[PDB]
């Protein structure tokens, strides 16, 4: 399924994922397509920062769900 | 038979769509997404402003 990741600059990143994918795995995908190292990534969904060891399904992230991304400076 | 859409549009509701017809379900889904998207942006902005302050008191 695809999910969307919006940055604070208006940019939208499209990802191919599965519900059982870990947040860490999602961060690696973002690194593949945007070059951003995983440890700089802060992912947000439904009012929460996403923890690396949980799954997309743990947060009810479904098909066409949109997350937000902030970078550590 | 009276299992009409919960939004009173006149069409029949779907038990799988929590009592809504297709259109009303779709409208609710969009509004719910829009709200969480917007709120998640507010949070992200707050997080950015937190990063900017930590970077300032750093280097
Ligand atoms: Zn309806």
UniProtKB/Swiss-Prot annotation, chain A:
The modification Phosphoserine is found at residue 65. This is Ubiquitin. There is a cross-link at residues 6, 11, 27, 29, 33, 48, 63 (Glycyl lysine isopeptide (Lys-Gly) (interchain with G-Cter in ubiquitin)). The record marks 68 as: Essential for function. It comes from Bos taurus (Bovine). The chain holds residues 1 to 73 of 128 of the full protein. Phosphorylated at Ser-65 by PINK1 during mitophagy. Phosphorylated ubiquitin specifically binds and activates parkin (PRKN), triggering mitophagy. Phosphorylation does not affect E1-mediated E2 charging of ubiquitin but affects discharging of E2 enzymes to form polyubiquitin chains. It also affects deubiquitination by deubiquitinase enzymes such as USP30. Mono-ADP-ribosylated at the C-terminus by PARP9, a component of the PPAR9-DTX3L complex. ADP-ribosylation requires processing by E1 and E2 enzymes and prevents ubiquitin conjugation to substrates such as histones. It is found in: Cytoplasm; Nucleus. It comes from the Eukaryota. Residues 1-73 form the Ubiquitin-like domain.
Curated annotation (Swiss-Prot), chain B:
It comes from Bos taurus. A zinc finger (A20-type) spans 1-33. This is Rab5 GDP/GTP exchange factor. Detected in brain. Changing residue 44 to D: Strongly reduced ubiquitin binding. Loss of ubiquitin binding. Monoubiquitinated. Residues 1-59 are annotated as: Interaction with ubiquitinated proteins. Heterodimer with RABEP1. The heterodimer binds RAB4A and RAB5A that have been activated by GTP-binding. Binds TSC2, GGA1, GGA2, GGA3, AP1G1 and AP1G2. Interacts with RAB21, and with 100-fold lower affinity also with RAB22. Interacts with ubiquitinated EGFR. Interacts with RGS14; the interaction is GTP-dependent. Rab effector protein acting as linker between gamma-adaptin and RAB5A. Involved in endocytic membrane fusion and membrane trafficking of recycling endosomes. Stimulates nucleotide exchange on RAB5A. Can act as a ubiquitin ligase. It is found in: Cytoplasm; Early endosome; Recycling endosome. The gene is RABGEF1. The chain holds residues 15 to 73 of 492 of the full protein. Zn(2+) binds at residues 5, 9, 21, 24. Changing residue 12 to A/P: Strongly reduced ubiquitin binding. Loss of ubiquitin ligase activity. The lineage of its organism: Eukaryota, Metazoa, Chordata, Craniata, Vertebrata.
């Amino acid at each position: 399924m695809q999910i969307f990741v919006k940055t604070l600059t208006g940019k939208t990143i499209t990802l191919e994922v599965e519900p059982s994918d870990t947040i860490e795995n999602v961060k690696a995908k973002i690194q593949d397509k945007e070059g951003i190292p995983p440890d700089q990534q802060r992912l947000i969904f439904a009012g929460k920062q996403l923890e690396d060891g949980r799954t997309l399904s743990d947060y009810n992230i479904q098909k066409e769900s949109t997350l937000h991304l902030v970078l550590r400076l | 038979s009276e299992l009409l859409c919960k939004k009173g549009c006149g069409y029949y509701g779907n038990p799988a769509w929590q009592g809504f017809c297709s259109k009303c379900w779709r409208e609710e889904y969009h509004k719910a997404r829009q709200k969480q998207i917007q709120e998640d942006w507010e949070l992200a902005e707050r997080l950015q402003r937190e990063e900017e302050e930590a970077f300032a008191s750093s280097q």
